[PDB]
Amino acid sequence: DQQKINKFARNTSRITELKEEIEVKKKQLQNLEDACDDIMLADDDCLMIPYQIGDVFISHSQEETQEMLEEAKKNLQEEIDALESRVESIQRVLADLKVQLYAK
Amino acid sequence: ADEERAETARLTSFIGAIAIGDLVKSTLGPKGMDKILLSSGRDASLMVTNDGATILKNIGVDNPAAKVLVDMSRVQDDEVGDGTTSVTVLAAELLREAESLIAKKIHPQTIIAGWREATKAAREALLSSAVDHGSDEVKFRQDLMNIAGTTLSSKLLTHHKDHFTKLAVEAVLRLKGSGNLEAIHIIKKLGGSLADSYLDEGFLLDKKIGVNQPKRIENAKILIANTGMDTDKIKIFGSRVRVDSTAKVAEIEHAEKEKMKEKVERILKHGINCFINRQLIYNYPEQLFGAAGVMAIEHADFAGVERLALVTGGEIASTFDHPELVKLGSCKLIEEVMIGEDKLIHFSGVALGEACTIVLRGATQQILDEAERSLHDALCVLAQTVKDSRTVYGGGCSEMLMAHAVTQLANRTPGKEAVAMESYAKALRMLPTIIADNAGYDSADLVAQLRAAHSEGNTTAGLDMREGTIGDMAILGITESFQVKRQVLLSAAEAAEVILRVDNIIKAA
Amino acid sequence: VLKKLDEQYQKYKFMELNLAQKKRRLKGQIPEIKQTLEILKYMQKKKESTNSMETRFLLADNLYCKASVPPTDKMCLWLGANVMLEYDIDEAQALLEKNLSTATKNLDSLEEDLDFLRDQFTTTEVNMARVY
Amino acid sequence: TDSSQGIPQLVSNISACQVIAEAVRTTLGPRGMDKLIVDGRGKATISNDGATILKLLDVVHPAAKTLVDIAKSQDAEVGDGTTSVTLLAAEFLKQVKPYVEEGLHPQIIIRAFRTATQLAVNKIKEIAVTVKKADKVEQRKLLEKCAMTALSSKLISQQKAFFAKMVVDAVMMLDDLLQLKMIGIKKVQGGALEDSQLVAGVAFKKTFSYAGFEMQPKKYHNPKIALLNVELELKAEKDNAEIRVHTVEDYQAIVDAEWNILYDKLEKIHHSGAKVVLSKLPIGDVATQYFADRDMFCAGRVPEEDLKRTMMACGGSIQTSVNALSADVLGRCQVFEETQIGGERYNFFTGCPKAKTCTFILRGGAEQFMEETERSLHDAIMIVRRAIKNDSVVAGGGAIEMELSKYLRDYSRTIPGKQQLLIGAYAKALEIIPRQLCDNAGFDATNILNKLRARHAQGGTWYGVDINNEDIADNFEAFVWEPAMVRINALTAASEAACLIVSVDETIKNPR
Amino acid sequence: LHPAARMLVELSKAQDIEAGDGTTSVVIIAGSLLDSCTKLLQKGIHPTIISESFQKALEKGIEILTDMSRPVELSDRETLLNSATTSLNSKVVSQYSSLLSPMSVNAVMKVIDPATATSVDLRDIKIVKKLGGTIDDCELVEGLVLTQKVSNSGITRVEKAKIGLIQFCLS
Amino acid sequence: KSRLMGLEALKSHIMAAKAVANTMRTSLGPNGLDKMMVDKDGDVTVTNDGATILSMMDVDHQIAKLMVELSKSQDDEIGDGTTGVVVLAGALLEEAEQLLDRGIHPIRIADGYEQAARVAIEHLDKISDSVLVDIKDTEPLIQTAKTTLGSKVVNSCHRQMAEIAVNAVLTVADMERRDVDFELIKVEGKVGGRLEDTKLIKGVIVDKDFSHPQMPKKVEDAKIAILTCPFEPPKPKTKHKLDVTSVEDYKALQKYEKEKFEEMIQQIKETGANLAICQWGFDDEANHLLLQNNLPAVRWVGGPEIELIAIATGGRIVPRFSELTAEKLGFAGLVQEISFGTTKDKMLVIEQCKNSRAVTIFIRGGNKMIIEEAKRSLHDALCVIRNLIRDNRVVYGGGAAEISCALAVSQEADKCPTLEQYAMRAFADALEVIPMALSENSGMNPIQTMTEVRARQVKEMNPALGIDCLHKGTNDMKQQHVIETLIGKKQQISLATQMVRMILKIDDIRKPGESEE
Amino acid sequence: VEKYQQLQKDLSKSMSGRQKLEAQLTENNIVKEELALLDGSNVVFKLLGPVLVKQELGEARATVGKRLDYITAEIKRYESQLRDLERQSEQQRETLAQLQQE
Incomplete structure (x- = not known):
């Protein structure tokens, strides 16, 4: 019975779960970003610009309408950097679990 | 493993190497026979050759004596040029002579020791046939047109040989004491006929650039470089690649327009009129080159750029590791001359008078590839003729000469070894039997006629095989x-003794 | 021996399905609590967002009626099981943030422990087989 | 279900048992025409005795399997006498085989087997002499003479007396039961035929020079021994490691951290207390850096067969596992030494807490004359360690076998009927060990037997043949000695298998 | 699949591309020459000798055959008309070659610029099928004749058109 | 089950031994005809050495399967003489059939073959006196390695090779009680320059890295920094992620790492050992930056290459950048750079006057094929000299000592007159097979060849006058200079009688269908 | 054989997004029935994410007209994707089945 391959099986499965979390956050990042550019291009401030918050609406400037989407893109991208900071940490154990099968 | 005994190995060496020697003696001589090519694998495609080297490439060789011959066939092919089919029959002519000695009782070390002394003795007789031709400009001109008909007709080109014969001996004449293949630039190109082929004094690139760039450059300064425009090379000027941000694209989009602007400033400060680039040149630096008078070449040859720095005295920029310390080439005239259906770049008046460019013009791909392979085999021999402006009298005339000299030494020495020297001098006379069979004549008559010639020493005349x-x-x-x-x-006497050395053959495959 | 390996392959695969029944119920809780915070925290009240705004009410899934909003300052949230209480912003805010933070951690802390509860089930069934 | 019965079944069992007796007929002699045995293994296997070769045979005759199992039962007790039970019982069946068609289909022989073998074992211990302390010996000259008896077979001049008294000492130190493989002589390139070294523990033949190999200690007072099972090197791992860069100091971190785990390999058992590092697998170039930096000795590519002998005498075991790395698995000694003999670094493990492997180390700088010395010593150990176990020692070499055949044709006269033909055949088979060694030493083999019977009609003291003096003599006065009990065991075992196979002329099979 | 037989299909193919006619006769001449080869190899004549003798006699035979021939015009359109159709009536198909002889005569006459009149490129001659129409309505249209056009809102008849080419993707 | 009894055993023992002895006897001496090999991968191989071919030939018989380990003992100890032990022992073997066909028992001759081996070894003590002083005896070894080189791999004897090869052995023998270890020396061969190029390296060699000639190409003081720690950024063959905040941050980063380059300098240089060598490699960007910063560094060094320089210097290796001392640095005698080959690049030769733990003869070639054939001539020349440096015992073999002991053993069949006389006769006539076989593969008549030196034994005993195999007509051993080690010929006596003893060891020749299957 | 399911999964994944278009295709025809009744009676906006942007009726007619055309562009490629993946795999069902047998 080997407990290092018990760590080796846990290590490779943690590689898989991290990369999938990056991909779903990248598609949400471009979805908000391309939602910014389309609504600015059509009809800036003429009388009022209604903006959806559920089923009630607020009327204000065109650039503030982007600004709510701009913040969520900032929060999402900082996660993507932190996700890849965990993708890097799951690779260092992978180079070291090969020796620990010979050590203990 | 199968341990081949010596009694079996001699039979295998005789069926292995002689049958290969049967094939190359067919495809010897322009009057000689040919060989149908039968591919050893499935779906056998056929070609008809007058070359024994291609026979070894198509038909696989797995005879252990004959696989030694494949190594010998490669050496005369690459390092020597012509002499591929001739060295392989000649070793087979030796091995046939060894058969009766093996049939008697005779050890091969008798046969080896005799042929070693007989080779060096005939080598001095080969040095006796060394006659200079670089003593005259005209006789060296007469020397080059002699051998140019010999190699090209030996390697399947005799119909338009004479148009290549006039052009090739001129470029070798400018080499003048130094044999050069890195000064003779070899260009094949589809277009025109084989009477449309061309000889340029200098260097050539097959670039159609028209009138957007300067194509007429007088008193050129040539920068030989590999510096691209969109590749973002070494000596960084702006942004580099990075991750984990979304607003850093603006520094990358702006930095490309600065690097292409700066490399125009880099190229102009050389002082050149011609920027030769291995890579692609973008449209915005290209239009900045033609207005000032800088020639722009994109998609240059990988070997042509390196041969350009040699012929012009310049140097490669080493992928922009040398931004200014890279030296410049200089030539007299750069002219765009339409040769055939194509627009060509002619670097004329380069710093090397040795430097030339032959321009091959084939009407199809079938004639164009077979012409260059014969022409490259010719120019290697002609470059060796620049170092030693000497001939030996062909048509088996030197073959009759050295076999007499061995026969004289075989009739002064003959202890144990010169039983082989008697078999040696026959195998030298076996080669003019082939050419008389290549011409298709009485080989026993023509040899014994030629044996009567060199017996008193008539050496200045041998058999002209066109009539025999x-x-x-x-x-x-x-x-x-x-x-x-x-x-x-050298090689035929060598490997045939090596075949005599391998009696302890072991097959483990 | 491959024979001992083959019995542990089938006992590992069958216990994967019992885990997916529990994770999807943990999965189904997460977007429903996710909709509660982000819609509230952006509008924040009729009161907090500075009087009368616009609205297009949800009467159905495809039928929205446009009108002027102005309500009084309360939110009648829905608890479930014959219960509605009127609420305000401060009561509704801190409750759902707690339900927001747990529903991720209910999904995260269990999905590792389910992966080892599967490993308990596959290991248990093979040691009794090799002995008796 | 298949079956074959009667005499054509029975004789088919006999000649099947003859062929395996045709093989081993002089394998106790050093000579014959060799068979290396390759099986579906595909591997090369030779031997010096038949008993190892008999372990290689998958027998196809079940009656011949019975003669194996009795001989393996003789092999299981001593390790010798496997051939003796084999040849005697077959030559019984050889001489009985004509008598069967003459009418020895009855089992009247089986009464003649026991009455023969009861008298014989009453002669063996009777003619044998009990001696341990000093009855004719020096307490050592018993073990000296038998070792000089074995080392006189090959023509070692006077070093055989020097080689004797050394291997006497290896037996007395180890002595717990009849086991010889711990004494097993290591062929040593280097040394001379005049120096010879006895080791109270074990030794390692070869170890290779690594970085800082001579910068590791040579003198210990207690080697704390770790008998590791893994191969160390830096090129055993694969690299995928990742972390963020803002400087070049991060470049030092990825390479050093892959070296600490290699340094973590050794420090776990070094902090457990171990100082001696041993692996039959190689040590890495970077891995042997820390071993010289630890200032603890390492030795890679040591023999695993020599590594097993360390487990017994030192109280050690096999090593690195996932857990339980402590002093409970380590081995101990009291003296470490590394003496380069020839050109190889040759290690000394002595001072062991357990006398479980006392090997003798022979030198000479050879392979052929030293193998001549070893094989005589391997049988010299087999005699003298059994000579300790039994105080009563008889003379070997067919001395007593010819005496029994003298005794029993006389007893054939006293026996009536068909059973005297058994006793005549019983006395017939006894000569079989003289039949080979006379033709091995070079003799008219039968005419020697005729000579030995006259010296039993006139003397009858110990008269047999010599293979090493190459004549006929009294083998006790020619000092060819071995304890009498294994002969008595062989007399019972050869009588047991022979009467059993002839008792079966009816064999039942099931091909389903 | 035989190498002598695989030269035969090459022999007629060269007769197809150089002439297109005499492709049956180019088969029969080669087997006739092989009958001459068997006599001389049984006689004991080297094939190198038999090769160069035939290459001389080939050059020699066409010289005497040229004297047998009579010179005809290549710039007179009418002389080309009489010369072609007499061969066309000599061949099997002349049922449609009657009206289609002078159409071909007017076609080549446009590319007969000199009197030397080189061999002919069929690599400017395009054959275009029209599904209906009549053999009487077959004619010569200059330039090139294209198949089905695909015009979404495009023009049908453009005067002084610019012929363009597209070699790039839109997706 | 088939049992091949006695003669029927020995007929199986004939046919493989008849095959392998006949393929060796065509290969004795410089007139030895070469052995060809097609591999199991179908690869052409041509040697003249048996220990190569017996390792390469797929052995298929108990006799043949023996010959791998039998020729293993000869080549590892002695070197040359792989053919002669096979020719001799098979010639006793085929004669032993004739004795068994005469009715002579196979055991009594196998008893006498060992005693026949004793009196031959007894004769070699009288043959060819054993005193050759250290400065002089290099020259017959210069002549002996001339014979191995000048006829087999190169027709005209590279003089620089045979004279360096006798000098590498005195480098190790003096430190090792007048003996050499074959792991303290190594025949190192790297083609790329000229086949005439041959050097002796007291340590090891590494290819010295310089990235630009505009940056200084240095070599300095005799101390090497045997490092695995980074003096230059290393590369364990993987990839991080790259991210910088600004371009001007990367502009300062070049100024930051330049101070970090000097810190790796000022740590190493204050300890000593200015030639820095690190195991993991790097590109040429910061390589010539460190060359500009005035310390040379070698990149992309092989794994075990840091170990062999450590034992050659005798010192240790520096594991980490924070652990810094001079005992973990190299202790070298001379560190100088010499160009690799003639045309491509340069090495860094690290010689030591301290530890001869890796003394490597370094040869070059203009052909890849010739160098292992050259090294195989050098492998056996470095094994025969190990015999001489211990004891200066030499033999004039090749036809002199073969006919000499064949006189003696045949005489010892008469002096010691008993049963082993035909065993000694089977030993003595088999000794004559060898100088026959030197003339058999030669062009000379071997039947004439055994006659001449036999008359010389009537003339003179203990001959330094045996046959030639250079066909010079001068039959000597001291003026033909064909001289070998007495230990090597004596080892060939032990090995040949070992094999005949080995095939005699059990009497079992029965199989279950599987004893060679 | 993994090559059997791989060509099927690459085909079936394209079909699922294609079946999404067909309900959109019908409702793109529904809105053109409703835009034809509007001539200024009711203006239209555009629902695009969290922002509801003003349109015109001619702006609406081109908008759903484009999205009608983008669906038909993805229909025709699948007809190429259908016949290619069913014919390539049909060749694979004969050859790759023989690989597992011998």
Whole structure:
């Protein structure tokens, strides 16, 4: 019975779960970003610009309408950097679990 | 593993190497026979050759004596040029002579020791046939047109040979003491006929650039470089690649327009009129080059750029590791001359008078590839003729000469070893039997006629094989190169003794 | 021996399905609590967002009626099981943030422990087989 | 279900048992025409005795399997006498085989087997002499003479007396039961035929020079021994490691951290207390850096067969596992030494807490004359360690076998009927060990037997043949000695298998 | 699949591309020459000798055959008309070659610029099928004749058109 | 089950031994005809050495399967003489059939073959006196390695090779009680320049890295920094992620790492050992930056290459950048750079006057094929000299000592007159097979060849006058200079009688269908 | 054989997004029935994410007209994707089945 391959099986499965979390956050990042550019291009401030918050609406400037989407893109991208900071940490154990099968 | 005994190995060496020697003696001589090519694998495609080297490439060789011959066939092919089919029959002519000795009782170390002494003795007889031709400009001009008909007709080109014969001997004449293949630029190109082929004094690139760039450059300064425009090379000027941000694209989009602007400033500060680039040149630096007078070449040849820095005295920029310390080439005239259907770049008046560019013009791909392979085999021999402007009298005339000298030494020495020297001098006379069979004549008559010639010492005349009659030597068209036979005599006597060395053959495959 | 390996392959695969029944119920809780915070925290009240705004009411899934909003300052949230209480912003805010933070951690802390509860089930069934 | 019965079944069992007796007929002699045995293994296997070769045979005759199992039962007790039970019982069946068609289909022989073998074992211990302390010996000259008896077979001049008294000492130190493989002589390139070294523990033949190999200690007072099972090197791992860069100091971190785990390999058992590092697998170039930096000795590519002998005498075991790395698995000694003999670094493990492997180390700088010395010593150990176990020692070499055949044709006269033909055949088979060694030493083999019977009609003291003096003599006065009990065991075992196979002429099979 | 037989299909193919006619006769001449080869190899003549003798006699035979021939015009359109159709009536198909002889005569006459009149490129001659129409309505249209056009809102008849080419993707 | 009894055993023992002895006897001496090999991968191989071919040939018989380990003992100890032990022992073997066909028992001759081996070894003590002083005896070894080189791999004897090869052995023998270890020396061969190029390296060699000639190409003081720690950024063959905040941050980063380059300098240089060598490699960007910063560094060094320089210097290796001392640095005698080959690049030769733990003869070639054939001539020349440096015992073999002991053993069949006389006769006539076989593969008549030196034994005993195999007509051993080690010929006596003893060891020749299957 | 399911999964994944278009295709025809009744009676906006942007009726007619055309562009490629993946795999069902047998 080997407990290092018990760590080796846990290590490779943690590689898989991290990369999938990056991909779903990248598609949400471009979805908000391309939602910014389309609504600015059509009809800036003429009388009022209604903006959806559920089923009630607020009327204000065109650039503030982007600004709510701009913040969520900032929060999402900082996660993507932190996700890849965990993708890097799951690779260092992978180079070291090969020796620990010979050590203990 | 299968341990082949010596009694079995001699039978295998005799069926292995001689049958290969049967094939190359067919495809010897322009009057000689040919060989159908049968592919050893499935779906056998057929070609008809007058070359034995291609036979080894198509038909697989797995005879252990004959696989030694494949190594010998490669050496005369690459390092020597012509003499591929000649060295392989000649070792087989030796091995046939060894058969009766093996049939008697005779050890091969008798046969080896005799042929080693007989080779060196005939080598001095080969040096006796060394006659200079660089003593005159005209006789060296007469020397080059002699051998140019010999190699090209030996490697399947005799119909438009004479148009290539006039052009090739001119470029070798400018080499003047130094044999050069890195000064003779070899260009094949589809277009025109084989009478449309061209010789440029200098260097050539097949670039159609028109009138957007300067194509007429007088008193050129040539920068030989590999510096691209969109590749973002070494000596960084702006942004580099990075991750984990979304607003850093603006520094990358702006930095490309600065690097292409700066490399125009880099190229102009060389002072050149011609920027030769291995890579693609973008449209915005290209239009900045033609207005000032800087020639722009994109998609340059990987080997042509390196041969350009040699012929012009310049140097490669080493992928923009040298931004200014890279030296410049200089030539007289750069002219765009339409040769055939294509627009060509002619670097004329380069710093090397040795430097030339032959321009091959084939009407199809079938004639164009076979012309260059024969022409490259010719120019290697002609470059060796620049170092040693010497001939030996072909048509088996030198073959009759050295076999007499061995026969004289075989009739002064003959202890144990010169039983082989008697078999040696026959195998030298076995080669003119082939050419008389290549011409298709009485080989027993023509040899014994030629044996009667060199017996008293009639050496200035051997057999002109176009009629098979005896004719002039020391230049005839048939008087061959000194450099060829001294390599062919070296290898054929060598590997045939090595075949005699391998009796302890073991097959483990 | 491959024979001992083959019995542990089938006992590992069958216990994967029992885990997916529990994770999807943990999965189904997460977007429903996710909709509660982000819609509230952006509008924040009729009161907090500075009087009368616009609205297009949800009467159905495809039928929205446009009108002027102005309500009084309360939110009648829905608890479930014959219960509605009127609420305000401060009561509704801190409750759902706690339900927001747990529903991720209910999905995260269990999905590792389910992966080892599967490993308990596959290991248990093979040691009794090799002995008796 | 298949079956074959009667005499054509029975004789088919006999000649099947003859062929395996045709093989081993002089394998106790050093000579014959060799068979290396390759099986579906595909591997090369030779031997010096038949008993190892008999372990290689998958027998196809079940009656011949019975003669194996009795001989393996003789092999299981001593390790010798496997051939003796084999040849005697077959030559019984050889001489009985004509008598069967003459009418020895009855089992009247089986009464003649026991009455023969009861008298014989009453002669063996009777003619044998009990001696341990000093009855004719020096307490050592018993073990000296038998070792000089074995080392006189090959023509070692006077070093055989020097080689004797050394291997006497290896037996007395180890002595717990009849086991010889711990004494097993290591062929040593280097040394001379005049020096010879006895080791109270074990030794390692070869170890290779690594970085800082001579910068590791040579003198210990207690080697704390770790008998590791893994191969160390830096090129055993694969690299995928990742972390963020803002400087070049991060470049030092990825390479050093892959070296600490290699340094973590050794420090776990070094902090457990171990100082001696041993692996039959190689040590890495970077891995042997820390071993010289630890200032603890390492030795890679040591023999695993020599590594097993360390487990017994030192109280050690096999090593690195996932857990339980402590002093409970380590081995101990009291003296470490590394003496380069020839050109190899040759290690000394002595001072062991357990006398479980006492090997003798022979030198000479050879392979052929030293193998001549070893094989005589391997049988010299087999005699003298059994000579300790049994105080009563008889003379070997067919001395007593010819005496029994003298005794029993006389007893054939006293026996009536068909059973005297058994006793005549019983006395017939006894000569079989003289039949080979006379033709091995070079003799008219039968005419020797005729000579030995006259010296039993006139003397009858110990008269047999010599293979090493190459004549006929009294083998006790020629000092060819071995304890009498294994002969008595062989007399019972050869009588047991022979009467059993002839008792079966009816064999039942099931091909389903 | 035989190498002598695989030269035969090459022999007629060269007769197809150089002439297109005499492709049956180019088969029969080669097997006739092989009958001459068997006599001389049984006689004991080297094939190198038999090769160069035939290459001389080939050059020699066409010289005497040229004297047998009579010179005809290549710039007179009418002389080309009489010369072609007499061969066309000599061949099997002349049922449609009657009206289609002078159409071909007017076609080549446009590319007969000199009197030397080189061999002919069929690599400017395009054959275009029209599904209906009549053999009487077959004619010569200059330039090139294209198949089905695909015009979404495009023009049908453009005067002084610019012929363009597209070699790039839109997706 | 088939049992091949006695003669029927020995007929199986004939046919493989008849095959392998006949393929060796065509290969004795410089007139030895070469052995060809097609591999199991179908690869052409041509040697003249048996220990190569017996390792390469797929052995298929108990006799043949023996010959791998039998020729293993000869080549590892002695070197040359792989053919002669096979020719001799098979010639006793085929004669032993004739004795068994005469009715002579196979055991009594196998008893006498060992005693026949004793009196031959007894004769070699009288043959060819054993005193050759250290400065002089290099020259017959210069002549002996001339014979191995000048006829087999190169027709005209590279003089620089045979004279360096006798000098590498005195480098190790003096430190090792007049003996050499074959792991303290190594025949190192790297083609790329000229086949005439041959050097002796007291340590090891590494290819010295310089990235630009505009940056200084240095070599300095005799101390090497045997490092695995980074003096230059290393590369364990993987990839991080790259991210910088600004371009001007990367502009300062070049100024930051330049101070970090000097810190790796000022740590190493204050300890000593200015030639820095690190195991993991790097590109040429910061390589010539460190060359500009005035310390040379070698990149992309092989794994075990840091170990062999450590034992050659005798010192240790520096594991980490924070652990810094001079005992973990190299202790070298000379560190100088010499160009690798003639045309491509340069090495860094690290010689030591301290530890001869890796003394490597370094040869070059203009052909890849010739160098292992050259090294195989050098492998056996470095094994025969190990015999001489211990004891200066030499033999004039090749036809002199073969006919000499064949006189003696045949005389010892008469002096010691008993049963082993035909065993000694089977030993003595088999000794004559060898100088026959030197003339059999030669062009000379071997039947004439055994006659001449036999008359010389009537003339003179203990001959330094045996046959030639250079066909010079001068039959000597001291003026033909064909001289070998007495230990090597004596080892060939032990090995040949070992094999005949080995095939005699059990009497079992029965199989279950599987004893060679 | 993994090559059997791989060509099927690459085909079936394209079909699922294609079946999404067909309900959109019908409702793109529904809105053109409703835009034809509007001529200024009711203006239209555009629902695009969290922002509801003003349109015109001619702006609406081109908008759903484009999205009608983008669906038909993805229909025709699948007809190429259908016949290619069913014919390539049909060749694979004969050859790759023989690989597992011998």
